[PDB]
Amino acid sequence: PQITLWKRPLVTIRIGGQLKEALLDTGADDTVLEEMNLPGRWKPKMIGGIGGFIKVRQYDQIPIEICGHKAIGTVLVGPTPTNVIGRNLLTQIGCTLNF
Amino acid sequence: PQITLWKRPLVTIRIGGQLKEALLDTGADDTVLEEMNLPGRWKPKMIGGIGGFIKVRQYDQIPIEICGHKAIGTVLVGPTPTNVIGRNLLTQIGCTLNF
Ligand SMILES: CC(C)(C)NC(=O)[C@@H]1CN(Cc2cccnc2)CCN1C[C@@H](O)C[C@@H](Cc1ccccc1)C(=O)N[C@H]1c2ccccc2C[C@H]1O
């Protein structure tokens, strides 16, 4: 579809069998989701945003559905105020920016 | 133009008669640039994101050219890791997400 930017670009995603609302963020290199208990082994990691760095848990090969579009990749889990879908996943569902 | 997301969506902006590089960021509500001098009066403000809150200077009705397209709006300047063009300006140039 086509999403305008008058409002935050929120979409419904499905991960770990759960449905959530995430922001489509062309500015995020990675995907960061709110704290949740995903199964599997993970690696500790530090990611930086506008106000500094936060510690996150990196999970690989996680299937995720973004607004009815299948994708699979790395997802970082940490104390983030909102779920962020980054370029790593946006590229998979053929998402582009137009103007 | 149509921009893919395999690489960071960077563009050249012109402001104050100066050239700079910035990121098209749909996850950012506002536009924030690295510290620099902008004519006019500014008011102290604070914005937050991943990592936390930072202190910025707010300049209103600043003219800025984004990859050839003109916009006039609020520009924030402060200790940002990178220049970010937020939704306030993306909407002015008719930017949308497509997939
Ligand atoms: C991988 C990760 C997700 C951690 N990336 C980012 O946060 C990058 C960081 N870089 C920097 C970087 C840092 C370290 C290394 N390389 C690059 C600068 C740009 N952001 C992208 C931002 O789009 C993220 C959003 C997240 C958010 C949305 C709503 C509410 C809270 C948090 C963000 O920071 N948004 C805020 C925002 C941003 C700009 C202007 C105004 C506002 C307000 C607010 O919407």
Report on this structure.
Chains A, B: This is Protease. Chains A, B: Homodimer, whose active site consists of two apposed aspartic acid residues. It is classed as hydrolase. Keywords: indinavir, inhibitor recognition, drug resistance, HIV-1 protease, hydrolase. It forms a dimeric assembly. 2 copies of one chain form a homodimer. By secondary structure, chain A is mostly beta strands. The first copy, chain A, has one domain: Beta Barrel (Cathepsin D, subunit A, domain 1). Chain A has 1 helix and 9 strands. In chain A, strands 2, 3, 4, 5, 6, 7 and 8 form a 7-stranded mixed sheet that branches. In chain A, strand 5 and strand 6 form a beta hairpin. The longest helix of chain A has 4 residues. The two termini of chain A are 15 Å apart. At the A-B interface, strand 1, strand 5, strand 6 and strand 9 of A face strand 1, strand 5, strand 6 and strand 9 of B. Strand 9 of chain A pairs antiparallel with strand 9 of chain B, so a sheet runs across the interface. Ligand MK1 sits at the interface of chains A and B.
Salient structural properties:
9 strands; Cathepsin D, subunit A, domain 1; mainly beta; seven-stranded mixed beta sheet; 99 residues; binds the ligand CC(C)(C)NC(=O)[C@@H]1CN(Cc2cccnc2)CCN1C[C@@H](O)C[C@@H](Cc1ccccc1)C(=O)N[C@H]1c2ccccc2C[C@H]1O; homodimer
